[PDB]
């Protein structure tokens, strides 16, 4: 019964309790806000090719 003197908690159960959640990448906040601000650039810039300014406040010709 030498196995009953070993620590009963496995090496697996350490690695699943220590690394419980996959950690958040540092660049995940950049490349998710950049792709969402590329839609703020597109719609709202006045130099974008797809601006909303001509379909929101139309024109007066």
């Amino acid at each position: 019964d030498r196995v009953l003197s070993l620590p009963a908690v496995s090496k697996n159960q350490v690695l699943e309790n220590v690394f419980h959640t996959a950690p958040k990448a540092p660049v995940e906040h950049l490349e998710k806000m950049v792709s969402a601000n590329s839609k703020v650039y597109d719609a709202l810039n006045l130099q974008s090719k797809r601006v909303l300014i001509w379909q929101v406040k139309p024109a007066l010709f």
């Binding site: 130099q47 974008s48 090719k49 797809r50 601006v51 001509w54 379909q55 024109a59």
Partner: protein, 73 residues
């Protein structure tokens, strides 16, 4: 109209953005096909002719966005 648009938007802002793009592409394509099912009708001929005029508006703005759509002057 302010209260209808604010409840339409707040229902739409609670969707994920992948749901929105395909709920709207399904509604746009179903409404195009109703104008392409109707052949020879004056309203469906004018419906698809205004879809070609919206696509002119989006293309005339892409050529000069600080100028807007190009009118014949």
């Amino acid at each position: 109209i302010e209260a209808e648009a604010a409840s339409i938007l707040d229902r739409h802002l609670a969707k994920p953005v992948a749901q929105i793009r395909k709920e709207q592409a399904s509604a746009y394509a179903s409404l195009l096909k109703r104008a392409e099912t109707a052949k020879g009708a004056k309203w469906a001929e004018k419906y698809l002719e205004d879809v070609k005029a919206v696509q002119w508006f989006d293309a005339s703005v892409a050529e000069a966005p600080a100028s807007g759509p190009k009118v014949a002057a």
